[PDB]
Amino acid sequence: TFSYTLEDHTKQAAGIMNELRLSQQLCDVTLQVKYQDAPAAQFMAHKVVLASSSPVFKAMFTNGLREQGMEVVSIEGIHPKVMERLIEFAYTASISMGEKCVLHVMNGAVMYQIDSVVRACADFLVQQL
Amino acid sequence: TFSYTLEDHTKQAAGIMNELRLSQQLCDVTLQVKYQDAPAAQFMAHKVVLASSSPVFKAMFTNGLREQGMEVVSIEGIHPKVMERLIEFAYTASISMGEKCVLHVMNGAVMYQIDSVVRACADFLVQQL
């Protein structure tokens, strides 16, 4: 037989997937975020990428129905900048925030069950003590 | 500020993306492979995943047109088992083959500009000498 594994591949393809999102190519979902009195914001993304990092997004998108293109999802109770940072983590595996936003990012991460950054935001808040 | 990076994330999300493909969930393209007298085969996949590992698939799918769901693509001149192994590499970053198939996998990899396994199949054939 013969087996080969490029360890760095998933990182590279994740980068191209993030490029297609920024170029708004091949996107099938638009997240319309309306939070309190802050201005509304739209984020286009790929359902399969969001589903691969968030079980909440996975159940939200796996409905057993054949979609016919762009689906609009209204998202409530989370600031647009926090949703953007979560979307960035799903595509790039990195997330950044000011120390006074770590609490809000954790709230959004708990809400969408992104365990990796829930644990990271929990760890940072504990050693602030 | 505050920055966090889960190195292992892209590998995990790639695994869930591969699971959604096997479950045929969130797929937007069906590859219908007809090669010589061999029986035809269908492979459902995600355009954004195939585009992230193959510039041929990326240009094929980024047309500037809003698609309305499942697109069917007829694929010629490559055996269904070779297309399956290439699809597997795009999702998992691993590819396996018998020594008498390394040549055919390279042909399909050159055809879809999957540089990583082109180089690997080229390396294996050279040390067969």
Curated annotation (Swiss-Prot), chains A, B:
Site (Sensor for electrophilic agents): C101
Tissue: Broadly expressed, with highest levels in skeletal muscle.
Residue ranges constituting the BTB domain according to the UniProt record: 27-99
S-(2-succinyl)cysteine modification, residue list: C101
Cross-link (N5-[4-(S-L-cysteinyl)-5-methyl-1H-imidazol-2-yl]-L-ornithine (Cys-Arg) (interchain with R-135 in KEAP1)): C101
Cross-link (N5-[4-(S-L-cysteinyl)-5-methyl-1H-imidazol-2-yl]-L-ornithine (Arg-Cys) (interchain with C-151 in KEAP1)): R85
Signal sequence range: none
Modified residues (S-nitrosocysteine): C101
Residues carrying S-(2,3-dicarboxypropyl)cysteine: C101
UniProt modification remark: Non-enzymatic covalent modifications of reactive cysteines by electrophile metabolites inactivate the BCR(KEAP1) complex. Accumulation of fumarate promotes the formation of cysteine S-succination (S-(2-succinyl)cysteine), leading to inactivate the BCR(KEAP1) complex and promote NFE2L2/NRF2 nuclear accumulation and activation. Nitric oxide-dependent 8-Nitro-cGMP formation promotes cysteine guanylation (S-cGMP-cysteine), leading to NFE2L2/NRF2 nuclear accumulation and activation.
Function of the molecule: Substrate-specific adapter of a BCR (BTB-CUL3-RBX1) E3 ubiquitin ligase complex that regulates the response to oxidative stress by targeting NFE2L2/NRF2 for ubiquitination. KEAP1 acts as a key sensor of oxidative and electrophilic stress: in normal conditions, the BCR(KEAP1) complex mediates ubiquitination and degradation of NFE2L2/NRF2, a transcription factor regulating expression of many cytoprotective genes.
Note on domains (UniProt): KEAP1 contains reactive cysteine residues that act as sensors for endogenously produced and exogenously encountered small molecules, which react with sulfhydryl groups and modify the cysteine sensors, leading to impair ability of the BCR(KEAP1) complex to ubiquitinate target proteins.
Subunit annotation: Component of the BCR(KEAP1) E3 ubiquitin ligase complex, at least composed of 2 molecules of CUL3, 2 molecules of KEAP1, and RBX1. Interacts with NFE2L2/NRF2; the interaction is direct. Forms a ternary complex with NFE2L2/NRF2 and PGAM5. Interacts with (phosphorylated) SQSTM1/p62; the interaction is direct and inactivates the BCR(KEAP1) complex by sequestering it in inclusion bodies, promoting its degradation. Interacts with NFE2L1. Interacts with BPTF and PTMA. Interacts with MAP1LC3B. Interacts indirectly with ENC1. Interacts with SESN1 and SESN2. Interacts with HSP90AA1 and HSP90AB1.
Similarity comment: family membership: Belongs to the KEAP1 family.
Protein name: Kelch-like ECH-associated protein 1
Native organism: Homo sapiens (Human)
Gene: KEAP1
Residues shown, of full length: 51 to 179 of 624
